[PDB]
Structure 1
Amino acid sequence: PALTKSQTDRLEVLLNPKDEISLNSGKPFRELESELLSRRKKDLQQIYAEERENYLGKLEREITRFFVDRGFLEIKSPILIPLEYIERMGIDNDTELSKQIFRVDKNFCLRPMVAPNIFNYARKLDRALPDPIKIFEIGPCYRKESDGKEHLEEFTMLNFFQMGSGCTRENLESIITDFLNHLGIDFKIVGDSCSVYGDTLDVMHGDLELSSAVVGPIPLDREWGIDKPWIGAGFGLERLLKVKHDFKNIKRAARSESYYNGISTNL
Protein backbone atom coordinates (compact mmCIF):
# COMPACT_ATOMS: atom_id res chain seq x y z
CA PRO A 1 0.00 0.00 0.00
CA ALA A 2 0.83 3.72 -0.12
CA LEU A 3 3.19 5.27 2.45
CA THR A 4 1.55 7.37 5.15
CA LYS A 5 2.62 10.98 5.67
CA SER A 6 4.16 9.95 9.04
CA GLN A 7 6.14 7.19 7.33
CA THR A 8 7.33 9.54 4.57
CA ASP A 9 8.44 12.03 7.24
CA ARG A 10 10.38 9.22 8.90
CA LEU A 11 12.10 8.24 5.66
CA GLU A 12 12.87 11.88 4.85
CA VAL A 13 14.69 12.20 8.17
CA LEU A 14 16.92 9.36 6.90
CA LEU A 15 17.14 10.69 3.35
CA ASN A 16 20.32 12.49 2.30
CA PRO A 17 20.59 14.75 -0.79
CA LYS A 18 23.05 12.23 -2.33
CA ASP A 19 20.45 9.42 -2.32
CA GLU A 20 18.58 8.43 -5.47
CA ILE A 21 15.83 6.31 -3.91
CA SER A 22 12.32 6.69 -5.35
CA LEU A 23 9.60 6.71 -2.69
CA ASN A 24 7.16 5.81 -5.49
CA SER A 25 8.31 2.17 -5.44
CA GLY A 26 7.08 -1.43 -5.09
CA LYS A 27 8.51 -1.80 -1.57
CA PRO A 28 7.02 -1.43 1.93
CA PHE A 29 8.00 1.18 4.52
CA ARG A 30 9.92 -1.39 6.57
CA GLU A 31 12.34 -2.21 3.73
CA LEU A 32 12.83 1.39 2.62
CA GLU A 33 13.59 2.30 6.24
CA SER A 34 15.99 -0.59 6.78
CA GLU A 35 17.88 0.33 3.60
CA LEU A 36 18.19 4.00 4.57
CA LEU A 37 19.21 3.11 8.14
CA SER A 38 21.94 0.89 6.73
CA ARG A 39 23.20 3.66 4.43
CA ARG A 40 23.19 6.31 7.16
CA LYS A 41 25.02 3.99 9.56
CA LYS A 42 27.66 3.48 6.83
CA ASP A 43 27.95 7.27 6.35
CA LEU A 44 28.74 7.74 10.07
CA GLN A 45 31.17 4.81 10.04
CA GLN A 46 33.06 6.34 7.09
CA ILE A 47 33.29 9.70 8.90
CA TYR A 48 34.45 7.95 12.07
CA ALA A 49 37.10 5.91 10.25
CA GLU A 50 38.40 8.72 8.03
CA GLU A 51 37.96 12.46 8.72
CA ARG A 52 36.15 12.70 12.10
CA GLU A 53 35.51 16.46 11.73
CA ASN A 54 32.26 18.27 12.43
CA TYR A 55 31.00 20.35 9.50
CA LEU A 56 30.29 23.45 11.60
CA GLY A 57 33.70 23.25 13.28
CA LYS A 58 35.49 22.52 10.02
CA LEU A 59 33.72 25.36 8.21
CA GLU A 60 34.74 27.75 11.00
CA ARG A 61 38.37 26.65 10.65
CA GLU A 62 38.27 27.10 6.86
CA ILE A 63 36.69 30.56 7.13
CA THR A 64 39.18 31.51 9.85
CA ARG A 65 42.13 30.59 7.62
CA PHE A 66 40.63 32.59 4.73
CA PHE A 67 40.33 35.79 6.75
CA VAL A 68 43.59 35.44 8.66
CA ASP A 69 45.39 35.02 5.29
CA ARG A 70 43.64 38.17 3.91
CA GLY A 71 44.97 40.27 6.83
CA PHE A 72 42.02 40.15 9.25
CA LEU A 73 42.62 39.78 13.01
CA GLU A 74 40.74 36.88 14.70
CA ILE A 75 38.57 38.06 17.60
CA LYS A 76 36.87 35.99 20.31
CA SER A 77 34.59 38.25 22.36
CA PRO A 78 31.90 37.56 24.95
CA ILE A 79 28.73 35.76 23.89
CA LEU A 80 27.01 37.05 27.03
CA ILE A 81 26.79 40.81 26.49
CA PRO A 82 25.06 43.74 28.26
CA LEU A 83 21.45 44.42 27.25
CA GLU A 84 22.60 48.03 27.03
CA TYR A 85 24.72 47.14 23.95
CA ILE A 86 21.49 46.16 22.15
CA GLU A 87 19.75 49.42 23.05
CA ARG A 88 22.86 51.18 21.67
CA MET A 89 22.46 49.32 18.37
CA GLY A 90 19.19 51.28 18.07
CA ILE A 91 16.80 48.62 19.40
CA ASP A 92 14.30 49.98 21.93
CA ASN A 93 11.98 47.79 24.07
CA ASP A 94 9.03 48.83 21.88
CA THR A 95 10.70 47.83 18.58
CA GLU A 96 10.28 44.41 16.91
CA LEU A 97 13.71 42.75 17.39
CA SER A 98 13.80 43.30 21.19
CA LYS A 99 11.25 40.50 21.63
CA GLN A 100 13.69 38.14 19.88
CA ILE A 101 16.36 38.65 22.61
CA PHE A 102 17.22 35.87 25.07
CA ARG A 103 17.70 37.71 28.37
CA VAL A 104 19.76 36.20 31.18
CA ASP A 105 19.66 38.72 34.03
CA LYS A 106 18.21 42.23 34.13
CA ASN A 107 21.64 43.34 32.86
CA PHE A 108 22.75 40.75 30.29
CA CYS A 109 21.60 38.82 27.25
CA LEU A 110 22.79 36.28 24.71
CA ARG A 111 24.24 38.26 21.84
CA PRO A 112 21.89 38.34 18.84
CA MET A 113 24.76 39.89 16.90
CA VAL A 114 28.52 40.42 17.23
CA ALA A 115 28.43 44.09 15.98
CA PRO A 116 28.68 45.70 19.38
CA ASN A 117 31.85 43.74 20.16
CA ILE A 118 33.28 44.35 16.69
CA PHE A 119 32.74 48.13 16.97
CA ASN A 120 34.34 48.21 20.43
CA TYR A 121 37.37 46.23 19.26
CA ALA A 122 37.67 48.52 16.21
CA ARG A 123 37.66 51.66 18.37
CA LYS A 124 40.16 50.24 20.86
CA LEU A 125 42.53 48.74 18.30
CA ASP A 126 42.59 51.97 16.28
CA ARG A 127 44.86 53.36 19.02
CA ALA A 128 47.38 50.53 18.47
CA LEU A 129 47.19 49.26 14.89
CA PRO A 130 48.09 50.76 11.51
CA ASP A 131 45.36 51.72 9.07
CA PRO A 132 43.26 50.01 7.90
CA ILE A 133 41.84 48.06 10.83
CA LYS A 134 40.74 44.60 9.68
CA ILE A 135 39.04 42.24 12.15
CA PHE A 136 36.71 39.23 12.13
CA GLU A 137 34.85 37.03 14.55
CA ILE A 138 33.11 33.70 14.18
CA GLY A 139 30.87 32.43 16.97
CA PRO A 140 27.43 31.71 18.46
CA CYS A 141 24.54 34.16 18.26
CA TYR A 142 20.99 33.74 19.57
CA ARG A 143 17.53 34.95 18.49
CA LYS A 144 14.04 33.69 19.44
CA GLU A 145 12.33 32.66 16.19
CA SER A 146 8.97 31.31 14.99
CA ASP A 147 10.34 30.02 11.65
CA GLY A 148 12.29 26.74 11.57
CA LYS A 149 12.88 26.41 7.81
CA GLU A 150 15.71 28.94 7.31
CA HIS A 151 15.89 30.26 10.91
CA LEU A 152 17.55 28.81 13.97
CA GLU A 153 17.40 30.12 17.50
CA GLU A 154 21.00 29.08 18.07
CA PHE A 155 23.26 29.88 15.11
CA THR A 156 26.84 30.72 14.18
CA MET A 157 27.82 34.05 12.65
CA LEU A 158 30.85 35.09 10.70
CA ASN A 159 31.41 38.84 10.87
CA PHE A 160 34.23 40.68 9.12
CA PHE A 161 34.92 44.39 9.36
CA GLN A 162 37.36 46.89 7.89
CA MET A 163 37.83 50.50 9.05
CA GLY A 164 39.86 53.40 7.61
CA SER A 165 41.27 53.22 4.06
CA GLY A 166 39.86 50.95 1.35
CA CYS A 167 36.33 50.89 2.77
CA THR A 168 34.44 50.99 -0.51
CA ARG A 169 31.46 49.12 -1.88
CA GLU A 170 33.77 47.73 -4.55
CA ASN A 171 36.23 46.24 -2.03
CA LEU A 172 33.33 44.91 0.09
CA GLU A 173 31.98 43.10 -2.96
CA SER A 174 35.45 41.74 -3.85
CA ILE A 175 35.96 40.20 -0.41
CA ILE A 176 32.48 38.70 -0.53
CA THR A 177 33.03 37.42 -4.05
CA ASP A 178 36.41 35.83 -3.26
CA PHE A 179 35.04 34.36 0.00
CA LEU A 180 32.04 32.63 -1.58
CA ASN A 181 34.00 31.47 -4.66
CA HIS A 182 36.57 30.02 -2.24
CA LEU A 183 33.85 28.08 -0.38
CA GLY A 184 32.22 27.12 -3.70
CA ILE A 185 28.83 28.69 -2.93
CA ASP A 186 26.81 30.35 -5.70
CA PHE A 187 25.46 33.84 -5.06
CA LYS A 188 24.37 37.21 -6.34
CA ILE A 189 24.72 40.61 -4.68
CA VAL A 190 21.72 42.97 -4.71
CA GLY A 191 21.17 46.45 -3.23
CA ASP A 192 18.12 46.22 -0.94
CA SER A 193 16.63 47.73 2.24
CA CYS A 194 17.06 46.48 5.83
CA SER A 195 16.33 48.91 8.70
CA VAL A 196 18.49 47.10 11.29
CA TYR A 197 21.29 49.41 10.02
CA GLY A 198 20.19 51.29 6.86
CA ASP A 199 20.94 50.87 3.15
CA THR A 200 22.61 47.50 2.54
CA LEU A 201 23.81 44.90 0.11
CA ASP A 202 22.05 41.57 0.25
CA VAL A 203 23.97 38.46 -0.74
CA MET A 204 21.41 35.95 -1.99
CA HIS A 205 21.39 32.29 -2.91
CA GLY A 206 18.08 32.23 -4.77
CA ASP A 207 15.48 33.33 -2.22
CA LEU A 208 17.86 32.62 0.68
CA GLU A 209 19.77 35.53 2.28
CA LEU A 210 23.34 34.49 3.05
CA SER A 211 24.33 37.91 4.31
CA SER A 212 23.42 41.51 4.86
CA ALA A 213 26.41 43.77 4.30
CA VAL A 214 27.01 47.44 5.03
CA VAL A 215 29.15 50.27 3.68
CA GLY A 216 29.64 52.87 6.41
CA PRO A 217 29.80 55.46 7.74
CA ILE A 218 26.32 55.40 9.31
CA PRO A 219 24.80 57.69 12.02
CA LEU A 220 25.03 54.91 14.64
CA ASP A 221 28.87 54.97 14.55
CA ARG A 222 29.20 57.89 16.98
CA GLU A 223 27.45 55.84 19.71
CA TRP A 224 30.40 53.39 19.40
CA GLY A 225 33.11 56.06 19.15
CA ILE A 226 33.71 55.32 15.47
CA ASP A 227 34.31 58.27 13.10
CA LYS A 228 36.01 56.64 10.09
CA PRO A 229 34.79 54.92 6.95
CA TRP A 230 34.03 51.21 7.36
CA ILE A 231 32.72 48.11 5.61
CA GLY A 232 31.37 44.90 7.06
CA ALA A 233 29.22 41.82 6.57
CA GLY A 234 27.71 38.97 8.57
CA PHE A 235 27.14 35.42 7.33
CA GLY A 236 25.34 32.54 9.03
CA LEU A 237 27.55 29.44 8.94
CA GLU A 238 24.55 27.08 9.09
CA ARG A 239 23.08 28.79 5.99
CA LEU A 240 26.35 28.32 4.13
CA LEU A 241 26.39 24.64 5.14
CA LYS A 242 22.75 24.22 4.13
CA VAL A 243 23.53 25.61 0.67
CA LYS A 244 26.88 23.85 0.26
CA HIS A 245 25.57 20.38 1.20
CA ASP A 246 22.09 20.87 -0.30
CA PHE A 247 20.24 20.18 2.98
CA LYS A 248 16.44 20.59 2.71
CA ASN A 249 16.13 22.06 6.23
CA ILE A 250 18.63 24.27 8.10
CA LYS A 251 18.29 22.19 11.29
CA ARG A 252 20.54 19.60 9.58
CA ALA A 253 23.43 22.12 9.73
CA ALA A 254 22.85 23.28 13.29
CA ARG A 255 24.34 22.40 16.64
CA SER A 256 22.14 19.40 17.37
CA GLU A 257 21.65 16.06 19.08
CA SER A 258 19.48 14.82 16.18
CA TYR A 259 21.87 15.40 13.26
CA TYR A 260 25.62 14.97 12.81
CA ASN A 261 26.98 16.45 9.58
CA GLY A 262 23.40 16.30 8.23
CA ILE A 263 23.02 12.61 9.12
CA SER A 264 20.28 11.51 11.52
CA THR A 265 21.60 10.30 14.85
CA ASN A 266 18.21 8.61 15.52
CA LEU A 267 19.01 5.29 13.88
Structure 2
Amino acid sequence: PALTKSQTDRLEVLLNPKDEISLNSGKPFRELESELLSRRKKDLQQIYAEERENYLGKLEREITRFFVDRGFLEIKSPILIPLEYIERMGIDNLSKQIFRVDKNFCLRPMLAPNLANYLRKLDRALPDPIKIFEIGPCYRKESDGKEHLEEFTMLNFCQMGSGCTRENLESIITDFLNHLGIDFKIVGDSCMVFGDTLDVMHGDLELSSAVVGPIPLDREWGIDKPWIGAGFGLERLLKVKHDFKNIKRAARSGSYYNGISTNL
Protein backbone atom coordinates (compact mmCIF):
# COMPACT_ATOMS: atom_id res chain seq x y z
CA PRO A 1 0.00 0.00 0.00
CA ALA A 2 1.74 3.14 -1.30
CA LEU A 3 1.77 6.47 0.57
CA THR A 4 0.27 9.55 -1.02
CA LYS A 5 2.12 12.85 -1.03
CA SER A 6 -0.21 14.12 1.72
CA GLN A 7 0.57 11.06 3.86
CA THR A 8 4.34 11.35 3.36
CA ASP A 9 4.13 15.07 4.16
CA ARG A 10 2.34 14.29 7.44
CA LEU A 11 4.92 11.69 8.42
CA GLU A 12 7.76 14.10 7.58
CA VAL A 13 6.19 16.70 9.90
CA LEU A 14 6.27 14.13 12.72
CA LEU A 15 9.70 12.68 11.93
CA ASN A 16 12.77 13.87 13.80
CA PRO A 17 16.45 13.54 12.83
CA LYS A 18 17.15 11.05 15.63
CA ASP A 19 14.56 8.62 14.26
CA GLU A 20 15.45 5.88 11.82
CA ILE A 21 12.16 4.73 10.29
CA SER A 22 11.55 3.79 6.67
CA LEU A 23 8.39 5.60 5.57
CA ASN A 24 7.86 3.42 2.48
CA SER A 25 8.71 0.04 4.01
CA GLY A 26 5.15 -1.18 3.35
CA LYS A 27 3.95 -0.63 6.90
CA PRO A 28 0.58 1.12 6.76
CA PHE A 29 0.31 4.87 7.17
CA ARG A 30 -1.88 4.42 10.26
CA GLU A 31 0.87 2.57 12.13
CA LEU A 32 3.67 4.91 11.05
CA GLU A 33 1.61 7.92 12.09
CA SER A 34 0.71 6.36 15.45
CA GLU A 35 4.33 5.45 16.19
CA LEU A 36 5.61 8.94 15.32
CA LEU A 37 2.81 10.64 17.26
CA SER A 38 3.76 8.61 20.33
CA ARG A 39 7.47 9.46 20.01
CA ARG A 40 6.71 13.17 19.60
CA LYS A 41 4.21 13.37 22.49
CA LYS A 42 6.84 11.70 24.70
CA ASP A 43 9.45 14.21 23.49
CA LEU A 44 7.19 17.20 24.22
CA GLN A 45 6.20 15.84 27.64
CA GLN A 46 9.87 15.45 28.54
CA ILE A 47 10.58 19.05 27.48
CA TYR A 48 7.67 20.26 29.60
CA ALA A 49 8.70 18.20 32.63
CA GLU A 50 12.43 18.95 32.49
CA GLU A 51 13.61 21.31 29.70
CA ARG A 52 11.12 24.20 29.38
CA GLU A 53 13.45 26.64 27.59
CA ASN A 54 12.81 27.61 23.98
CA TYR A 55 15.72 26.79 21.66
CA LEU A 56 15.82 30.26 20.10
CA GLY A 57 15.56 31.99 23.47
CA LYS A 58 18.17 29.72 25.06
CA LEU A 59 20.61 30.20 22.18
CA GLU A 60 20.17 33.99 22.35
CA ARG A 61 20.97 33.87 26.08
CA GLU A 62 24.04 31.66 25.51
CA ILE A 63 25.37 33.96 22.78
CA THR A 64 24.64 37.03 24.92
CA ARG A 65 26.72 35.67 27.81
CA PHE A 66 29.58 34.85 25.41
CA PHE A 67 29.80 38.38 24.01
CA VAL A 68 29.11 40.25 27.26
CA ASP A 69 31.93 38.27 28.91
CA ARG A 70 34.30 39.22 26.06
CA GLY A 71 33.65 42.94 26.54
CA PHE A 72 30.89 43.67 24.02
CA LEU A 73 27.97 45.91 25.03
CA GLU A 74 24.53 44.29 24.57
CA ILE A 75 22.28 46.39 22.30
CA LYS A 76 18.51 46.17 21.80
CA SER A 77 17.55 48.57 18.99
CA PRO A 78 14.33 49.14 16.99
CA ILE A 79 12.95 46.40 14.74
CA LEU A 80 10.61 48.88 13.03
CA ILE A 81 13.04 51.31 11.34
CA PRO A 82 12.88 54.23 8.87
CA LEU A 83 12.53 53.20 5.24
CA GLU A 84 15.23 55.80 4.44
CA TYR A 85 17.81 53.44 5.96
CA ILE A 86 17.38 51.04 3.02
CA GLU A 87 18.62 53.28 0.20
CA ARG A 88 21.25 54.81 2.48
CA MET A 89 22.67 51.30 2.95
CA GLY A 90 23.27 51.03 -0.79
CA ILE A 91 20.34 48.67 -1.30
CA ASP A 92 19.45 50.10 -4.71
CA ASN A 93 16.01 50.08 -6.27
CA LEU A 94 17.49 42.77 -1.77
CA SER A 95 15.34 45.90 -2.12
CA LYS A 96 12.41 43.73 -3.25
CA GLN A 97 12.89 41.69 -0.06
CA ILE A 98 11.94 44.54 2.32
CA PHE A 99 8.66 44.38 4.27
CA ARG A 100 7.27 47.92 4.21
CA VAL A 101 5.19 49.34 7.06
CA ASP A 102 2.93 52.38 6.53
CA LYS A 103 4.66 54.82 4.14
CA ASN A 104 7.96 55.73 5.80
CA PHE A 105 8.91 52.59 7.80
CA CYS A 106 9.97 49.01 7.25
CA LEU A 107 10.92 45.92 9.21
CA ARG A 108 14.70 45.80 9.50
CA PRO A 109 16.30 43.23 7.13
CA MET A 110 19.57 43.33 9.10
CA LEU A 111 20.99 44.81 12.27
CA ALA A 112 23.88 46.72 10.66
CA PRO A 113 22.41 50.25 10.29
CA ASN A 114 21.29 50.49 13.91
CA LEU A 115 24.68 49.17 15.04
CA ALA A 116 26.50 51.69 12.81
CA ASN A 117 24.57 54.47 14.56
CA TYR A 118 25.51 53.07 18.00
CA LEU A 119 29.21 52.77 17.07
CA ARG A 120 29.26 56.43 15.98
CA LYS A 121 27.43 57.67 19.07
CA LEU A 122 29.30 55.52 21.59
CA ASP A 123 32.69 56.55 20.15
CA ARG A 124 32.07 60.00 21.66
CA ALA A 125 31.87 58.57 25.19
CA LEU A 126 33.59 55.20 25.50
CA PRO A 127 37.26 54.19 25.36
CA ASP A 128 38.81 52.56 22.33
CA PRO A 129 37.90 49.99 21.07
CA ILE A 130 34.09 50.15 20.87
CA LYS A 131 32.65 46.61 20.98
CA ILE A 132 28.89 46.00 20.71
CA PHE A 133 26.49 43.32 19.57
CA GLU A 134 22.77 42.72 19.08
CA ILE A 135 20.55 39.67 18.71
CA GLY A 136 17.02 39.97 17.45
CA PRO A 137 14.39 39.59 14.75
CA CYS A 138 15.03 40.59 11.13
CA TYR A 139 12.72 40.29 8.11
CA ARG A 140 13.17 39.52 4.40
CA LYS A 141 10.77 38.36 1.73
CA GLU A 142 12.25 35.11 0.42
CA SER A 143 11.45 32.34 -1.99
CA ASP A 144 10.48 29.11 -0.27
CA GLY A 145 13.71 27.35 0.67
CA LYS A 146 15.07 24.92 3.23
CA GLU A 147 17.54 27.56 4.52
CA HIS A 148 15.52 30.81 4.48
CA LEU A 149 12.82 32.22 6.72
CA GLU A 150 10.95 35.46 6.21
CA GLU A 151 11.14 36.13 9.98
CA PHE A 152 14.54 35.12 11.34
CA THR A 153 16.89 36.05 14.18
CA MET A 154 20.24 37.76 13.60
CA LEU A 155 23.33 38.13 15.77
CA ASN A 156 25.66 40.92 14.66
CA PHE A 157 28.76 41.74 16.65
CA CYS A 158 31.12 44.49 15.68
CA GLN A 159 34.10 46.52 16.82
CA MET A 160 35.45 49.93 15.88
CA GLY A 161 38.87 51.45 16.58
CA SER A 162 41.93 49.39 17.40
CA GLY A 163 42.05 45.67 16.77
CA CYS A 164 39.89 45.83 13.65
CA THR A 165 41.89 43.43 11.51
CA ARG A 166 41.01 40.36 9.50
CA GLU A 167 42.99 38.20 11.93
CA ASN A 168 41.08 39.46 14.96
CA LEU A 169 37.73 39.09 13.16
CA GLU A 170 38.59 35.49 12.25
CA SER A 171 39.73 34.81 15.81
CA ILE A 172 36.43 36.03 17.30
CA ILE A 173 34.46 33.92 14.80
CA THR A 174 36.63 30.91 15.62
CA ASP A 175 36.19 31.34 19.37
CA PHE A 176 32.43 31.83 18.96
CA LEU A 177 31.82 28.78 16.78
CA ASN A 178 34.18 26.67 18.89
CA HIS A 179 32.04 27.69 21.90
CA LEU A 180 28.93 26.40 20.06
CA GLY A 181 30.70 23.24 18.81
CA ILE A 182 30.20 24.04 15.10
CA ASP A 183 32.88 23.31 12.51
CA PHE A 184 33.33 25.79 9.70
CA LYS A 185 35.52 27.16 6.93
CA ILE A 186 35.92 30.74 5.65
CA VAL A 187 35.33 31.48 1.94
CA GLY A 188 35.46 34.79 0.11
CA ASP A 189 32.22 36.16 -1.34
CA SER A 190 30.80 39.56 -2.22
CA CYS A 191 27.59 41.46 -1.61
CA MET A 192 25.92 44.65 -2.77
CA VAL A 193 25.94 46.49 0.57
CA PHE A 194 29.40 45.79 1.96
CA GLY A 195 31.52 44.50 -0.94
CA ASP A 196 33.91 41.65 -0.23
CA THR A 197 32.83 39.40 2.62
CA LEU A 198 34.38 36.56 4.54
CA ASP A 199 31.59 34.01 4.49
CA VAL A 200 31.53 31.48 7.32
CA MET A 201 30.41 28.15 5.83
CA HIS A 202 29.30 24.88 7.38
CA GLY A 203 29.42 22.67 4.33
CA ASP A 204 27.31 24.48 1.76
CA LEU A 205 25.33 26.38 4.43
CA GLU A 206 26.24 30.04 4.93
CA LEU A 207 26.29 30.73 8.66
CA SER A 208 27.57 34.32 8.42
CA SER A 209 28.90 37.10 6.29
CA ALA A 210 31.66 39.14 7.95
CA VAL A 211 33.29 42.37 6.84
CA VAL A 212 36.58 44.17 7.45
CA GLY A 213 36.22 47.92 7.09
CA PRO A 214 36.64 50.65 6.14
CA ILE A 215 34.26 50.60 3.15
CA PRO A 216 32.91 53.51 1.06
CA LEU A 217 29.52 53.31 2.79
CA ASP A 218 31.17 54.46 6.04
CA ARG A 219 30.97 58.16 5.14
CA GLU A 220 27.18 58.03 4.76
CA TRP A 221 26.90 56.68 8.34
CA GLY A 222 29.50 58.94 9.95
CA ILE A 223 31.86 56.01 10.53
CA ASP A 224 35.43 57.23 10.31
CA LYS A 225 37.55 54.55 12.00
CA PRO A 226 38.57 50.96 11.24
CA TRP A 227 35.87 48.44 12.06
CA ILE A 228 35.02 44.75 11.78
CA GLY A 229 31.68 42.97 12.01
CA ALA A 230 29.81 39.75 11.32
CA GLY A 231 26.16 38.72 11.08
CA PHE A 232 24.92 35.19 11.88
CA GLY A 233 21.47 33.61 11.60
CA LEU A 234 20.48 31.88 14.84
CA GLU A 235 18.00 29.52 13.11
CA ARG A 236 20.81 28.36 10.81
CA LEU A 237 22.99 27.66 13.87
CA LEU A 238 20.08 25.65 15.34
CA LYS A 239 19.61 23.77 12.05
CA VAL A 240 23.24 22.65 12.21
CA LYS A 241 23.18 21.83 15.92
CA HIS A 242 20.04 19.69 15.68
CA ASP A 243 20.48 18.30 12.12
CA PHE A 244 17.10 19.68 11.03
CA LYS A 245 16.21 19.07 7.37
CA ASN A 246 14.30 22.36 7.09
CA ILE A 247 15.05 25.60 8.88
CA LYS A 248 11.32 25.94 9.69
CA ARG A 249 11.91 23.54 12.61
CA ALA A 250 14.02 26.27 14.19
CA ALA A 251 11.81 29.28 13.49
CA ARG A 252 9.36 31.29 15.52
CA SER A 253 6.33 29.30 14.77
CA GLY A 254 3.16 27.98 16.10
CA SER A 255 3.84 24.74 14.17
CA TYR A 256 7.02 23.49 15.89
CA TYR A 257 8.24 23.71 19.49
CA ASN A 258 11.97 23.01 19.77
CA GLY A 259 11.74 21.14 16.48
CA ILE A 260 8.74 19.00 17.57
CA SER A 261 5.51 19.32 15.65
CA THR A 262 2.75 21.01 17.63
CA ASN A 263 0.14 19.28 15.43
CA LEU A 264 -0.24 16.19 17.63
TM-score of the pair, normalised by structure 1: 0.97
Which residue of 2 is the match for residue 245 of structure 1?
Answer: 242
Alignment check: 8 A CA contact 2:90 2:192 kept: no
Deviation of 1:25 (Å): 2.7
Question: How large is the RMSD of aligned CA atoms in angstroms?
Answer: 0.9
SS in 2 for 1:156: strand
Measured in 2, the distance between the counterparts of 1:26 and 1:147 equals: 31
Match of 1:178 among 175, 179, 188: 175
- Cα deviations by residue, 1:212-247 (Å, 9 ceiling, x for unpaired): 100000010011111100000000000100111000
Unpaired runs of at least 5, structure 2: none
Q: What CA distance in whole angstroms lies between the structure 1 residues aligned with 2:107 and 2:3?
A: 43
Decide whether the 8 Å contact of 1:253 with 1:262 is kept in 2.
yes
Alignment deviations for residues 9-35 of structure 1 (CA, whole Å, 9 cap, x no partner): 111110000111122434211011001
Give distance in 1, aligned partners of 2:31 and 2:144: 33
Unaligned runs of 5+ in 1: none
> 1-side partners of 2:176 and 2:153: how far apart?
17
Matches of 1:205 and 1:149, distance apart in 2: 15
Matching of residue 134 in structure 1 with residue 131 in structure 2 = yes
* Structure 1 residue 195 displacement after superposition: 2.4
Q: 8 Å contact 1:148–1:251 — kept in the other structure?
A: no
For residues 170-205 of structure 1, give each alpha carbon's deviation from its aligned partner in whole angstroms, at most 9, with x where no partner exists: 010011011111111121111222222101101011
> How do residues 1-267 of structure 1 correspond to structure 2 at under 5 angstroms?
1-93=1-93, 97-267=94-264
Q: What is the CA-CA distance between 1:148 and the residue it aligns to?
A: 2.8
Counting matched residue pairs gives 264
Cα gap change, 1:39/1:247 in structure 2, threshold over 3 Å: closer, same or farther?
Answer: same
User: Identity of aligned pairs, percent?
Assistant: 97
- SS of residue paired to 1:19: coil
Q: Deviations over 1:64-92 (max 9, x none)?
A: 00000111000000001001111110123
* 8 A contact 2:2–2:26 mirrored in 1: no
Q: Deviations over 1:18-57 (max 9, x none)?
A: 1111224342110110010000000000000001000000
Return the TM-score normalized by structure 2.
0.98
